[PDB]
Design an enzyme around this catalytic site. Structure first.
Site, PDB file in Angstrom:
ATOM      1  N   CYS A 108       0.804  -1.236   0.000  1.00 14.40           N
ATOM      2  CA  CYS A 108       0.000   0.000   0.000  1.00 14.40           C
ATOM      3  C   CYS A 108       0.837   1.287   0.000  1.00 14.40           C
ATOM      4  O   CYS A 108       1.586   1.531   0.933  1.00 14.40           O
ATOM      5  CB  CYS A 108      -0.962   0.026   1.196  1.00 14.40           C
ATOM      6  SG  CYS A 108      -2.014   1.509   1.217  1.00 14.40           S
ATOM      7  N   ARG A 111      -0.131   4.641   2.880  1.00 14.30           N
ATOM      8  CA  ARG A 111      -0.063   4.440   4.320  1.00 14.30           C
ATOM      9  C   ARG A 111       0.254   5.659   5.169  1.00 14.30           C
ATOM     10  O   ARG A 111       0.246   5.567   6.391  1.00 14.30           O
ATOM     11  CB  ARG A 111       0.903   3.300   4.647  1.00 14.30           C
ATOM     12  CG  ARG A 111       0.317   1.940   4.363  1.00 14.30           C
ATOM     13  CD  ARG A 111       1.353   0.885   4.672  1.00 14.30           C
ATOM     14  NE  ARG A 111       2.338   0.744   3.605  1.00 14.30           N
ATOM     15  CZ  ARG A 111       3.472   0.065   3.735  1.00 14.30           C
ATOM     16  NH1 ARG A 111       3.762  -0.505   4.903  1.00 14.30           N
ATOM     17  NH2 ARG A 111       4.301  -0.058   2.697  1.00 14.30           N
ATOM     18  N   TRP A 280      -9.321   6.015  -1.079  1.00 16.15           N
ATOM     19  CA  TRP A 280      -9.629   6.727  -2.308  1.00 16.15           C
ATOM     20  C   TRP A 280      -8.629   6.270  -3.362  1.00 16.15           C
ATOM     21  O   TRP A 280      -7.611   5.663  -3.026  1.00 16.15           O
ATOM     22  CB  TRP A 280      -9.629   8.250  -2.113  1.00 16.15           C
ATOM     23  CG  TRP A 280      -8.408   8.832  -1.476  1.00 16.15           C
ATOM     24  CD1 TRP A 280      -7.214   9.132  -2.085  1.00 16.15           C
ATOM     25  CD2 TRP A 280      -8.273   9.238  -0.107  1.00 16.15           C
ATOM     26  NE1 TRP A 280      -6.349   9.698  -1.170  1.00 16.15           N
ATOM     27  CE2 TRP A 280      -6.977   9.765   0.050  1.00 16.15           C
ATOM     28  CE3 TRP A 280      -9.133   9.203   1.001  1.00 16.15           C
ATOM     29  CZ2 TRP A 280      -6.508  10.238   1.286  1.00 16.15           C
ATOM     30  CZ3 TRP A 280      -8.672   9.683   2.224  1.00 16.15           C
ATOM     31  CH2 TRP A 280      -7.369  10.191   2.354  1.00 16.15           C
ATOM     32  N   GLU A 285      -4.314   3.712 -10.957  1.00 14.28           N
ATOM     33  CA  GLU A 285      -5.113   2.484 -10.815  1.00 14.28           C
ATOM     34  C   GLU A 285      -6.219   2.444 -11.849  1.00 14.28           C
ATOM     35  O   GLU A 285      -6.478   1.414 -12.459  1.00 14.28           O
ATOM     36  CB  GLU A 285      -5.760   2.400  -9.429  1.00 14.28           C
ATOM     37  CG  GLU A 285      -4.763   2.359  -8.275  1.00 14.28           C
ATOM     38  CD  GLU A 285      -5.458   2.260  -6.929  1.00 14.28           C
ATOM     39  OE1 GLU A 285      -5.876   1.132  -6.556  1.00 14.28           O
ATOM     40  OE2 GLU A 285      -5.591   3.310  -6.258  1.00 14.28           O
TER      41      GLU A 285
HETATM   42  C1  HEM Z   1      -6.595   6.438   1.703  1.00  8.35           C
HETATM   43  C2  HEM Z   1      -6.188   6.293   0.438  1.00  8.35           C
HETATM   44  C3  HEM Z   1      -5.458   5.042  -0.101  1.00  8.35           C
HETATM   45  C4  HEM Z   1      -4.712   5.023  -1.217  1.00  8.35           C
HETATM   46  C5  HEM Z   1      -4.437   6.237  -2.145  1.00  8.35           C
HETATM   47  C6  HEM Z   1      -4.195   3.680  -1.403  1.00  8.35           C
HETATM   48  C7  HEM Z   1      -3.370   3.253  -2.436  1.00  8.35           C
HETATM   49  C8  HEM Z   1      -3.104   1.934  -2.746  1.00  8.35           C
HETATM   50  C9  HEM Z   1      -2.626   1.426  -4.019  1.00  8.35           C
HETATM   51  C10 HEM Z   1      -2.333   2.316  -5.252  1.00  8.35           C
HETATM   52  C11 HEM Z   1      -2.484   0.099  -3.914  1.00  8.35           C
HETATM   53  C12 HEM Z   1      -2.050  -0.896  -5.016  1.00  8.35           C
HETATM   54  C13 HEM Z   1      -3.413  -1.334  -5.571  1.00  8.35           C
HETATM   55  C14 HEM Z   1      -3.395  -2.156  -6.835  1.00  8.35           C
HETATM   56  O1  HEM Z   1      -2.460  -1.989  -7.658  1.00  8.35           O
HETATM   57  O2  HEM Z   1      -4.352  -2.966  -7.025  1.00  8.35           O
HETATM   58  C15 HEM Z   1      -2.893  -0.284  -2.577  1.00  8.35           C
HETATM   59  C16 HEM Z   1      -2.881  -1.566  -2.068  1.00  8.35           C
HETATM   60  C17 HEM Z   1      -3.303  -1.957  -0.816  1.00  8.35           C
HETATM   61  N1  HEM Z   1      -3.915  -1.141   0.127  1.00  8.35           N
HETATM   62 FE1  HEM Z   1      -3.962   0.957   0.076  1.00  8.35          FE
HETATM   63  N2  HEM Z   1      -4.656   2.902  -0.357  1.00  8.35           N
HETATM   64  C18 HEM Z   1      -5.452   3.697   0.465  1.00  8.35           C
HETATM   65  C19 HEM Z   1      -6.130   3.270   1.593  1.00  8.35           C
HETATM   66  C20 HEM Z   1      -6.093   2.004   2.143  1.00  8.35           C
HETATM   67  C21 HEM Z   1      -6.811   1.539   3.315  1.00  8.35           C
HETATM   68  C22 HEM Z   1      -7.818   2.405   4.112  1.00  8.35           C
HETATM   69  C23 HEM Z   1      -6.468   0.257   3.532  1.00  8.35           C
HETATM   70  C24 HEM Z   1      -6.930  -0.710   4.660  1.00  8.35           C
HETATM   71  C25 HEM Z   1      -7.452  -0.314   5.830  1.00  8.35           C
HETATM   72  C26 HEM Z   1      -5.502  -0.110   2.513  1.00  8.35           C
HETATM   73  C27 HEM Z   1      -4.879  -1.335   2.389  1.00  8.35           C
HETATM   74  C28 HEM Z   1      -4.237  -1.852   1.282  1.00  8.35           C
HETATM   75  C29 HEM Z   1      -3.814  -3.231   1.127  1.00  8.35           C
HETATM   76  C30 HEM Z   1      -3.947  -4.414   2.130  1.00  8.35           C
HETATM   77  C31 HEM Z   1      -3.193  -3.297  -0.264  1.00  8.35           C
HETATM   78  C32 HEM Z   1      -2.585  -4.547  -0.911  1.00  8.35           C
HETATM   79  C33 HEM Z   1      -3.686  -5.202  -1.743  1.00  8.35           C
HETATM   80  C34 HEM Z   1      -3.148  -6.468  -2.361  1.00  8.35           C
HETATM   81  O3  HEM Z   1      -2.097  -6.978  -1.886  1.00  8.35           O
HETATM   82  O4  HEM Z   1      -3.784  -6.957  -3.331  1.00  8.35           O
HETATM   83  N3  HEM Z   1      -5.290   0.984   1.690  1.00  8.35           N
HETATM   84  N4  HEM Z   1      -3.252   0.860  -1.889  1.00  8.35           N
HETATM   85  C1  LIG Z   2      -4.397  -9.305  -6.602  1.00 11.70           C
HETATM   86  N1  LIG Z   2      -5.206  -8.090  -6.775  1.00 11.70           N
HETATM   87  C2  LIG Z   2      -4.858  -7.478  -8.067  1.00 11.70           C
HETATM   88  C3  LIG Z   2      -6.636  -8.450  -6.749  1.00 11.70           C
HETATM   89  C4  LIG Z   2      -7.505  -7.232  -6.511  1.00 11.70           C
HETATM   90  C5  LIG Z   2      -8.856  -7.244  -6.856  1.00 11.70           C
HETATM   91  C6  LIG Z   2      -9.644  -6.119  -6.638  1.00 11.70           C
HETATM   92  C7  LIG Z   2      -9.072  -4.986  -6.069  1.00 11.70           C
HETATM   93  C8  LIG Z   2      -7.725  -4.971  -5.719  1.00 11.70           C
HETATM   94  O1  LIG Z   2      -7.147  -3.860  -5.167  1.00 11.70           O
HETATM   95  C9  LIG Z   2      -6.162  -3.948  -4.142  1.00 11.70           C
HETATM   96  C10 LIG Z   2      -6.359  -2.679  -3.362  1.00 11.70           C
HETATM   97  C11 LIG Z   2      -6.527  -2.722  -1.984  1.00 11.70           C
HETATM   98  C12 LIG Z   2      -6.744  -1.547  -1.284  1.00 11.70           C
HETATM   99  C13 LIG Z   2      -6.770  -0.333  -1.958  1.00 11.70           C
HETATM  100  C14 LIG Z   2      -6.969   0.839  -1.251  1.00 11.70           C
HETATM  101  C15 LIG Z   2      -7.006   2.045  -1.954  1.00 11.70           C
HETATM  102  C16 LIG Z   2      -6.815   2.050  -3.329  1.00 11.70           C
HETATM  103  N2  LIG Z   2      -6.829   3.223  -4.013  1.00 11.70           N
HETATM  104  N3  LIG Z   2      -6.621   0.893  -3.992  1.00 11.70           N
HETATM  105  C17 LIG Z   2      -6.595  -0.289  -3.338  1.00 11.70           C
HETATM  106  C18 LIG Z   2      -6.401  -1.464  -4.050  1.00 11.70           C
HETATM  107  C19 LIG Z   2      -6.948  -6.093  -5.941  1.00 11.70           C
END
Ligand code: HEM
Ligand SMILES: CN(C)Cc1cccc(OCc2ccc3ccc(N)nc3c2)c1
Ligand code: HEM
Ligand SMILES: CN(C)Cc1cccc(OCc2ccc3ccc(N)nc3c2)c1
Ligand SMILES: C[C@H](O)[C@H](O)[C@H]1CNc2nc(N)[nH]c(=O)c2N1
Ligand SMILES: C[C@H](O)[C@H](O)[C@H]1CNc2nc(N)[nH]c(=O)c2N1
Ligand SMILES: [Zn+2]
Lengths: 404, 416
Positions: A108, A111, A280, A285
């Site tokens: 993420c 963070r 958000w 993305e």
């Molecule tokens: C507040 C604005 C936030 C932004 C701009 C953001 C941004 C991102 C981005 C760009 C990714 C990569 C997503 C992808 O390529 O599919 C990501 C992944 C992730 N985000 Fe954040 N995020 C936000 C909030 C959060 C929140 C609130 C949580 C949980 C409480 C969170 C937890 C995660 C987790 C667990 C991943 C990894 C997902 C995976 O491994 O498939 N994010 N985030």
């Molecule tokens: C392995 N992944 C690609 C599967 C998958 C399916 C659907 C959604 C997805 O998004 C991951 C993810 C998790 C948290 C987020 C929080 C904020 C954000 N802007 N994007 C996020 C994106 C990821």
């Protein structure tokens, strides 16, 4: 011993001492690194050790380690596990644990926001209908008429010999993908499978490129039930471009709220199989991955043609030029609609500030370079030049198998 | 199913298993507790010279392995000639502490080193490497002659040809051959009294060493550096490359007429000269090699890195972009036009160049060839994915497995 970590743009060095706190194995070994793989290949004392570590983390966080409340809480947890094989979190512990899970998420980039998370306790949910009500309230709160607020709703934990609470959808808002038997997919090809499940569970499908899917919600040991989201709850942004008047004619749009709903939240050894969370979007993305991936909406060539670019050859960089304009249209459109969005430059800069905060706070920060570096303009952002150490800390968000 | 890493391509949904990593006999930097895949130079990827010859047991096992690789490659594994070569290497080591490679072994070894290089996207070309044997070299003047010949051959008036020149190996009780410069062609970097750098900030240290060794410095942004060449147990000597040997390309843009006025240029030949070539335990401390450029190396990294020429803002100002706000995507817009200028200018000058789309497409083909030939391909995703337009290329969506195979090109410490 501990990794020495260098920023190649600035020449600065740090040492990650935090990774020594990891108790869970990643996929790499000294023989070979599997850092670029998306998914993993695959009693009482263990639970109790995870519980105590978490309770310890909690009482440390409120500056009360060693207090009598700390010791009594450890005794409560131990008595519950020894008697029942499991235990339950206080609301305040759950709140702390959800924030820590976000803080610990190596993939993420958002963070810097981790301390600002609205946690909804939905653990007194006993039916799919009740889950739906909690989900609608989450969506309403998080959306906030375009002023997005991060939030998580936590449904009841997994229990031995009982089915899980699950949301079958990967996100609360997803567009349908309809497989026209002549090969193609209308809509989002990422969602063909969930779309078909919805139809066979009784959903009457549309035939549009951007049809919002109903939710499939499963209470323990019951078939999932189908719930259509009230259209007023689903905020969407029509895509237009600031200077290319024809862009609006593409009929493109995206939803405001990124709300992942299929991840498992693990806190103190307890597992929450349904705990949807939302933030958000970062513009890439939508603009780069969702719209331009060859296995998603795949709009690059369409946009390139409207720009009258030379599609005949790679060296004209037509793909690069089109992708830039699509990303610009996403930013412009969300800004015009007053819907919260962050561009990849702003995001990566805030992440660098986060790495610095975490170095001082915890002596490190787990980060997955391949996910943190954006999918366009990689080396134009500061994170590209920053070495990162990837490791698993708990509380954590994890992947889990699809329920079907 | 199988006990090997399962590797997925997320664009195509296709799956392979890497069985080749079972042949690795050298640990990388990662552990189950933490991944260090993004580190440029982790200690595990470092080497250091030894004055005294290696433990003969260690050398012999590496030598045997390489001889086994060679005889497998020519389909003569288990043969009388294979056993005789093994006995010959073992006796050589027994009497002298080291051994020497036959010409065909060196050729095979150098090609396999390139084939094995996990950070190289250009490996579709690996079988086409001209190997120049310079193991008879005995002086810095002679090294210079070999290097000039290498440059003339490889440049080929703009129709670039891959090549490596191999100087004598490290030897017990004798100093190394070393090229001090990191590439055969580099632009000087002059630190200014204000603290800034005129030229390439990457090359400040080498520039100052050249000056310390008698070079009379220029004061331009693209001054070609002299070579500091070191023969065994001697101080390095300074050699100036004759200008006509160093092919350069002035940069222009196909549509933006003002771009030419920026006075930018880059050299044609990427010729890395500071890596160690290791074959069967033998160490070739001077073995410069060259291919041709991928455009993003010049246009994105060398010209736009903040710690390199850093021209992004200047170009964006010329394009009249809003540089005061991130969301205008000015950096992205300027970067595309710079990369386009590089491609257009090299093509106009008839100098070999490959764009990053063409290169990554060819690397996917290489991965498929190698899956069939060897059961896998060591690859470092962070290095293979280009520095702009990442997910627009097929390699972004391909999982990769990174591991160390020998023969190998390795990092070695600077000789100073
Ligand atoms: C507040 C604005 C936030 C932004 C701009 C953001 C941004 C991102 C981005 C760009 C990714 C990569 C997503 C992808 O390529 O599919 C990501 C992944 C992730 N985000 Fe954040 N995020 C936000 C909030 C959060 C929140 C609130 C949580 C949980 C409480 C969170 C937890 C995660 C987790 C667990 C991943 C990894 C997902 C995976 O491994 O498939 N994010 N985030
Ligand atoms: C392995 N992944 C690609 C599967 C998958 C399916 C659907 C959604 C997805 O998004 C991951 C993810 C998790 C948290 C987020 C929080 C904020 C954000 N802007 N994007 C996020 C994106 C990821
Ligand atoms: C034929 C055309 C070639 C192309 C297009 C090419 C492309 C590339 C690129 C883009 C990189 C990344 C470099 C960086 O970011 O600094 C690289 C790395 C590398 N290349 Fe190739 N290459 C070619 C030929 C060769 C040859 C002939 C050799 C050796 C015989 C070679 C060996 C290597 C090695 C060892 C690296 C890793 C360097 C490091 O880790 O610092 N390449 N190549
Ligand atoms: C770790 N690096 C940053 C150090 C360094 C210094 C100087 C050059 C360099 O380039 C690596 C390299 C090696 C071989 C190449 C072959 C062809 C090519 N086009 N680029 C290459 C690029 C790498
Ligand atoms: C194969 C590779 O690991 C995969 O395509 C990764 C690369 N980096 C990513 N980075 C982000 N943010 N999201 C992704 O889905 C991916 N996909
Ligand atoms: C910190 C990070 O590993 C570093 O900036 C890497 C990333 N990927 C790279 N990829 C290539 N091809 N060349 C590089 O120099 C780098 N640098
Ligand atoms: Zn790793």
């Amino acid at each position: 011993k501990f990794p020495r970590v260098k920023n190649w743009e600035l020449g600065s060095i740090t040492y990650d001492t935090l990774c020594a706190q990891s108790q869970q194995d990643g996929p790499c070994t000294p023989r070979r690194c599997l850092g670029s793989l998306v998914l993993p290949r695959k009693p009482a004392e263990q639970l109790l050790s995870q519980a105590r570590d978490f309770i310890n983390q909690y009482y440390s966080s409120i500056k009360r380690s060693g207090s009598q409340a700390h010791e009594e809480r450890l005794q409560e947890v131990e008595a519950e596990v020894a008697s029942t094989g499991t235990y339950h979190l206080r609301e305040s512990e759950l709140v702390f644990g959800a924030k820590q899970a976000w803080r610990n998420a190596p993939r993420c980039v958002g963070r810097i926001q981790w301390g600002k998370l609205q946690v909804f306790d939905a653990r007194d949910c006993s039916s799919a209908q009740e889950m739906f009500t909690y989900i609608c309230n989450h969506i309403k709160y998080a959306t906030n008429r375009g002023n997005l607020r991060s939030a998580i709703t936590v449904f009841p934990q997994r229990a031995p010999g009982r089915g899980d609470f699950r949301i079958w959808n990967s996100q609360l808002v997803r567009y349908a993908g309809y497989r026209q038997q002549d090969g193609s997919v209308r809509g989002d090809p990422a969602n063909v499978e969930i779309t078909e499940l919805c139809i066979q569970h009784g959903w009457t499908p549309g035939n549009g490129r951007f049809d919002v899917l109903p939710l499939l919600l499963q209470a323990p040991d019951e078939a999932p039930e189908l719930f259509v989201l009230p259209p007023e709850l689903v905020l969407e942004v029509p895509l237009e471009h600031p200077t290319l008047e024809w862009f609006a004619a593409l009929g493109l749009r995206w939803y405001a709220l990124p709300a992942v709903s299929n991840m498992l939240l693990e806190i103190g050894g307890l597992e929450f199989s349904a705990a949807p969370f939302s933030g958000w979007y970062m513009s890439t993305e939508i603009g780069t991955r969702n719209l331009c991936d060859p296995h998603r909406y795949n709009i690059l060539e369409d946009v390139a043609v409207c720009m009258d670019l030379d599609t005949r050859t790679t060296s004209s960089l037509w793909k690069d030029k089109a992708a830039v304009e699509i990303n610009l249209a996403v930013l412009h459109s969300f800004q015009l609609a007053k819907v919260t969005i962050v561009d990849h430059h702003a995001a990566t800069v805030s992440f660098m500030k986060h790495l610095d905060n975490e170095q001082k706070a915890r002596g490190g920060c787990p980060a997955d370079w391949a996910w943190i570096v954006p999918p366009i303009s990689g080396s134009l952002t500061p994170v590209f030049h920053q070495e990162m150490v990837n490791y698993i800390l708990s509380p954590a968000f994890r992947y889990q198998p699809d329920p079907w």
